[PDB]
Subunit: 140 residues, 3 copies
């Protein structure tokens, strides 16, 4: 009868250890990435995105993303944000620092790219763009 | 004295079971909805919103929402997003695919509607809009 | 041998109490602030922001923020949103209610201010702006 009690106590300790493991994991528990400003390249925080090349990223998780950034201006001025082949934003103003992005549903395999007409039209040390995953509902 | 120990062990098991219940619930624990592209109608992920009619939704929780979507163009072109009776955005460009929405504080009872000037001006299979609840602070 | 069992049971109870404390804290666990519409002044929900003056706020945590609001129009019309000294948005339209803000990376010490050309150009009872912290990755 002592042995039973002692065997239950051993089982209880083990469950408590398991629980503290679950709690540790809960305490630890969004996906984001940013390119630039140079000299910084891709910075990230399963991944929802994969860097492709400078200024260009690939989406690895279906979902609702917010894209953000700024282009600092330094041949007509033109900076374009692309989703795959579709131009999704064009920046045209050479005087002011301009915001880039918006909220987009994106699917596995999509790419996002920020392309400069002339590389030297832009102050690469105050120009950057990033992305954050807001949600991944089943319907996307 | 054995009985006490055994009764405490029974009480402990029950508390552990309760704890694992609380953990299960924590592990399980945003509100979102999307209309379209057709043939899809309302898709959702207490609810913060209630569908009203096609393209139209009602808010059931006070809060800060982000509205998103795109209108794919196919009589002057005009698509309008409404909050109640107030037009909150107008889309006028027949060439490019255009984003819809922005961040809005919304209150219980508000409605959001996307209204097309001509139904057939739009490619309904690449046009959709959705909403996500970002936060519900007391001040809204 | 009884004493050992009893001492283990005491230790177990204490661990369970600790666990329920951790769970309580987990259950309790975004930073936001809103100014206006008047007569309301600053409303908030370590803080990520500190009010400075009416319509003006200081950032105390590095991070990615979404700024939102609306200006309800009532000398050429001009309302400007500032980040430090940089104008980041200008509102110029005296007919429609206009959205303010966008997504911005902000650093400790930055200020955000909404400045009216003429105070009485605006309906202060339907004009307000607010901010929400989306994320604080190491790279900001």
């Amino acid at each position: 009868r002592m042995k039973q009690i002692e065997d239950k106590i051993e089982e209880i300790l083990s469950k408590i250890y398991h629980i503290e493991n679950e709690i540790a994991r809960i305490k630890k528990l969004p996906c984001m990435a940013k390119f630039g400003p140079l000299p910084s390249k891709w910075q990230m925080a399963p991944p929802c995105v994969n860097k492709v090349s400078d200024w260009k990223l690939e989406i690895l998780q279906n979902g609702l993303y917010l894209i953000y950034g700024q282009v600092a201006p330094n041949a007509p001025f033109e900076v374009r944000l692309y989703k795959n082949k579709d131009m999704i934003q064009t920046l045209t103003n050479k005087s002011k620092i301009q915001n880039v992005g918006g909220t987009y549903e994106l699917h596995v395999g999509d790419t996002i790219d920020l392309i400069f007409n002339s590389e030297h039209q832009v102050l690469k040390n105050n120009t950057y763009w990033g992305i954050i995953l807001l949600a991944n509902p089943q319907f996307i």
